[PDB]
């Protein structure tokens, strides 16, 4: 029911922009380290932010250190780890903290399963854990069940399924909450939110943006509550270029 997005906003309208990274601004790759945001796209994002009072943020499951490397040389407001890390327009960073005993126990628990399963990868993000299986989709059900058991045993932790990944995150952390935190701060406050994303974590952002009277954009295939849809990452690129140079 999402409608194909074909119109680009005017460069100097009253929008606040939120972009997911993987699968939205950058093409999907077999490995996260092979992902690149083309420099021309980064320039377009920087120019779009500059014409909108700096109201543009990257909202991603990646850590903020990884976002800064992907966005180099540009420094944007960020939400990393689905919002458990955040950096506002003034550079102030906000980090969700888990008890050290929880981080220590869960990591040791997860390690035992993932050492024995080739193709799976345990990624520790400080306040979250990501179970990757892009190279071994047959282990999805086992990783999902493990993450479900962990998130049921530790009430501080919540489940976040995604593309080729099952993530364990702090309870209450989600991309709708990240966008909410920005939308009450300058320069995002008073503007109309626009959020472009591609995965299940982005549906939380689509919901708050729809409720806000903003513009929600799904990239790629799949059911969504986004109001609008772009077919692929190059369609995001062309949309971004049309905003800057209509």
Curated annotation (Swiss-Prot):
What residues make up the catalytic site?
A: 20
**A single Gene Ontology molecular function, please?**
trehalose-phosphatase activity
EC annotation? 3.1.3.12
Q: Which residues bind Mg(2+)?
A: 20, 22, 198
What is this enzyme's class at the first EC digit? Answer: hydrolase
Describe which pathway this protein belongs to, using the record's wording: Glycan biosynthesis; trehalose biosynthesis
Q: Where is the signal peptide?
A: none
Cofactor(s) recorded in Swiss-Prot or TrEMBL: Mg(2+)
Q: Which UniProt keywords apply?
A: Hydrolase, Magnesium, Metal-binding
Could you tell me which InterPro entries the record lists for this protein? HAD-like_sf, HAD-SF_hydro_IIB, HAD_sf, OTSB-like, Trehalose_PPase
Could you state one GO biological process linked to this protein? trehalose biosynthetic process
**Catalyzed reaction equations:** alpha,alpha-trehalose 6-phosphate + H2O = alpha,alpha-trehalose + phosphate
Q: Is this entry keyworded Calcium?
A: no
* Residues binding substrate: 20-22
Function of the protein:
Removes the phosphate from trehalose 6-phosphate to produce free trehalose.
Q: Which family does it belong to?
A: Belongs to the trehalose phosphatase family.
Tell me the protein's name.
Trehalose-phosphate phosphatase
Q: Which organism is it from?
A: Salmonella typhimurium (strain SL1344)
In the UniProt record, the gene name given for this protein reads otsB
């Amino acid at each position: 029911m999402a409608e194909p997005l074909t119109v680009s906003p005017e460069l100097t309208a009253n929008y606040a922009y939120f972009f997911d990274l993987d699968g939205t601004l950058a093409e999907i790759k077999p490995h996260p380290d092979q992902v690149v945001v083309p420099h021309k796209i980064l320039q377009l994002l920087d120019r779009l932010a500059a014409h909108n009072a700096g109201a543009l943020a990257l909202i991603s499951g990646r850590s903020m250190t990884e976002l800064d490397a992907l966005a180099k040389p540009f420094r944007f407001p960020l939400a990393g780890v689905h919002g458990a890390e955040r950096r506002d327009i003034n550079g102030k960073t906000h980090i969700v903290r888990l008890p050290e005993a929880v981080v220590r126990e869960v990591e040791a628990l997860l390690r035992s399963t993932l050492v024995a399963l080739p193709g799976t990868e345990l990624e520790s993000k400080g306040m979250a854990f990501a179970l990757h299986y892009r190279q071994a989709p047959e282990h999805e059900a086992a990783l999902l069940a493990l993450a479900q058991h962990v998130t049921q045993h530790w009430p501080q932790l919540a489940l976040q399924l995604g593309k080729c990944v099952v993530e364990i995150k702090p309870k209450g952390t989600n991309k709708g909450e990240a966008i909410a935190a920005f939308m009450q701060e300058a320069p995002f406050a008073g503007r109309i939110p626009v959020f472009v994303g591609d995965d299940l974590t982005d549906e939380a952002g689509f919901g708050v943006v729809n409720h806000a009277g903003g513009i929600s954009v799904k990239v790629g295939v799949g059911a969504t509550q986004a109001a609008w849809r772009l077919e692929s990452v190059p369609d995001v690129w062309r949309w971004l270029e049309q905003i800057n140079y209509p």
